[PDB]
Amino acid sequence: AASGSALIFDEEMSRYKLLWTDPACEIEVPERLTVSYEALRTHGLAQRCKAVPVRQATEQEILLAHSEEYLEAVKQTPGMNVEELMAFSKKYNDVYFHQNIYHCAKLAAGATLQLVDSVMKREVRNGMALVRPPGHHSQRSAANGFCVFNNVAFAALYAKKNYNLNRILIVDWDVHHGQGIQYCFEEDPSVLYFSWHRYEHQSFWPNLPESDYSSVGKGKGSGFNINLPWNKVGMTNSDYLAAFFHVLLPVAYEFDPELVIVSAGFDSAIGDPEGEMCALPEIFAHLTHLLMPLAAGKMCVVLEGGYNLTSLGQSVCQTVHSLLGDPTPRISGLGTACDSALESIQNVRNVQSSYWSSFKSVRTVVVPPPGVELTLPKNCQHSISESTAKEVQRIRDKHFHDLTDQNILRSLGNIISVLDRMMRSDEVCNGCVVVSDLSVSVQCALQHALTEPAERVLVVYVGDGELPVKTNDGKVFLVQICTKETEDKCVNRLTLCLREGESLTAGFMQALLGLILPVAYEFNPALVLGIVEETARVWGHMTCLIQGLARGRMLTLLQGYDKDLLELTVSALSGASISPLGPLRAPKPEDVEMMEKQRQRLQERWGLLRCTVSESW
Ligand SMILES: NCCCNCCCCCC(=O)NO
Ligand SMILES: [K+]
Ligand SMILES: [K+]
Ligand SMILES: [Zn+2]
Structure with a gap:
């Protein structure tokens, strides 16, 4: 290339x-x-x-x-x-x-x-x-x-x-x-x-x-x-x-x-x-x-x-x-x-x-599952400190007492190691970590970043469950792309439920350019946290465009091992080219209506979403 x-x-x-x-x-x-x-x-x-x-x-x-x-x-x-x-x-x-x-x-x-x-x-x-x-x-x-x-x-x-x-x-x-x-x-x-x-x-x-x-x-x-x-x-x-x-x-x-x-x-x-x-x-x-x-x-x-x-x-x-x-x-x-x-x-x-x-020297750090070895681009590198090992021990006994899976502990040590190199070392920019348990991994990644300190963290989650993510203090914004239509309560979470079919790429791209990017840019996060679950294409364009926030410091947590998905996040995180989207079937009106209802719900707080002149009372 x-x-x-x-x-x-x-x-x-x-x-x-x-x-x-x-x-x-x-x-x-x-x-x-x-x-x-x-x-x-x-x-x-x-x-x-x-x-x-x-x-x-x-x-x-x-x-x-x-x-x-x-x-x-x-x-x-x-x-x-x-x-x-x-x-x-x-x-x-x-x-x-x-x-x-x-x-x-x-x-x-x-x-x-x-x-x-x-x-x-x-x-x-x-x-x-x-x-x-x-x-x-x-x-x-x-x-x-x-x-x-x-x-x-x-x-x-x-x-x-x-x-x-x-x-x-x-x-x-x-x-x-x-x-x-x-x-x-x-x-x-x-x-x-x-x-x-x-x-x-x-x-x-x-x-x-x-x-x-x-x-x-x-x-x-x-x-x-x-x-x-x-x-x-x-x-x-x-x-x-x-x-x-x-x-x-x-x-x-x-x-x-x-x-x-x-x-x-x-x-x-x-x-x-x-x-x-x-x-x-x-x-x-x-x-x-x-x-x-x-x-x-x-x-x-x-x-x-x-x-x-x-x-x-x-x-x-x-x-x-x-x-x-x-x-x-x-x-x-x-x-x-x-x-x-x-x-x-x-x-x-x-x-x-x-x-x-x-x-x-290194832009992207990758931690595949133990044993998996893959060809990495020139500016990427594989993954452990004794201080990190002690902190994972400290985190376990206070918040996860009944937890002994020593491979779950391995990923948590990598999450801390990758985050420490991204924010403090200034020698690593972003990274990707393959993850087994979601709830404990997201909690460790999000909580360790806030005390790094990352004053604001943007979380983009492609999944369906509810994650240990508190969005009530203004330090975290939650972007969730799910399958079940969820009523969004508050002005600091953005949940997109796209009606499945062959129209998802067009609808997701319109939500990315029209909702996600305007909100993320006004939020001005100190770090982006990408999360994808196993049940969950378009992720390459998302990974590249979202690197405009937080100086490109993004940590992507992939649940389960998909080499195709892993290889694409790492390629986009490393700065490689993104293969163009072809012709997309125009988005479904039910999705455009859903995306416009979210703009109405959020544009009073996030003015960058406005594409109209506001009506003066
Ligand atoms: N302030 C008075 C307007 C005078 N305008 C002069 C035209 C030069 C155009 C140069 C340019 O930058 N083209 O892109
Ligand atoms: K033209
Ligand atoms: K012009
Ligand atoms: Zn000019």
Whole structure:
């Protein structure tokens, strides 16, 4: 399988700049590239990525998305002086030209195609290209918004032609609307374009009516263009995550893309002069991580905007951190989206209701049963202290007097050993332990974590019984996926009873993206505890996405030995790729009704669940 992450960059693309007075473009400086690459080198991230050289995009590759007349007009700019370059740039909106910009434009485009090839050739698992000029505003016969050629549009068309892909997802989290990408794939159902952008009721640049939520695509591409307009500035982490959980992610996993291309503009981060939003650079580590379970991890990150030189480097490294599989930082202070964001999210979901189902040294430690030996990935390891042995003795005599099964005692010693290495040693991140007795193992795992201390523990249990888990003090949230419909009493437990059949994968994924993840992210646990009983596919996507919480510190307790299940949890816990879910039969209405009743029951306490504007009394 593929491994590593590509970092495509070249200092040549920082060798064009603005040569005349223009306050509209004076923020697009060469230092954007040099600051971002040097930030990756300072933090040791560039040295960890496979450096792929940039090449020039050929003429025929440029003609994939641009006209011959516009290409030949740009081709003449290297021969122009300052006066002629100023006159040529006046023919367009918010863009300047340079003697070298046509050279770097072909390099920025070629760098994107180099990144597409390395990912599609399985030479790397994912990658990022630091390019200038940007591209998502560029159109078929016009330069626009600092862009000359549409790099991301090139990547999708290049991937369609040379690899025969049928479904490509484009995620534009830049703060500006990439109308060039929208125009290019307006009638193409093979490319799904998502974009959030500062809109302010069309008053913000580029002031386009097509940037609104009602532009869903044209013809056979209807429903494959998703615009989410930000009508107020200061959007926070809660707004960005609500946009993912309730708009992008449900559509993305139903779309099931064969490749993910990200128009990664970081002017959506706090401190940027263009965006004026308030999301921290840490949010981009999660925006990346939440998309990695798609397309078997094949993700191509292309740089677009980002103009606060300090805010830029921080978010670039947070993106590469997630691409390399590093633990995601904890996000605190999460809550409901603001009213403006909730109105936007509500409107996009309604207009897309007719096109999509959901609307209207060691990273992992494994302890198999005694004697079972299995092949482990490179970053995983098998399992005992004398202090742990004494503590298991102390736990036994106080809480389990009539208990002598010396193999049950073995697992409890491993649970303490694994948890001690996860929280305190900082050398182990997560782990998986095969378990015989559930009630004693869950009790030991949960109680030992609270005194570690883990101030908050999220428990995700796939079973039917009741477990020794107290959820009455705010330190524990219980997520239970069961077979028997249980009346949920209190606002700190989430019980999902899915009506059995061939619709469980679709219903579970909708509950994962729409209920579990929004609640888990607001809860901000210090450790995740996964529990699966013997009587109890989709667990790989759950294990990977849930690692966005608690810095990826998850302990999974598997009851009984299933090598297939064991091998999948360990693979997902270790950071390996997750095989894509195929086409899923749309969820049963009885499950959607059940999931919406739980949202009504919990969204007043966990505002991140809200996908509507609350009714004021
Ligand atoms: N604050 C006033 C609005 C001026 N807007 C200038 C357009 C440049 C677009 C660059 C970009 O980041 N594209 O993604
Ligand atoms: K955007
Ligand atoms: K589209
Ligand atoms: Zn931008």
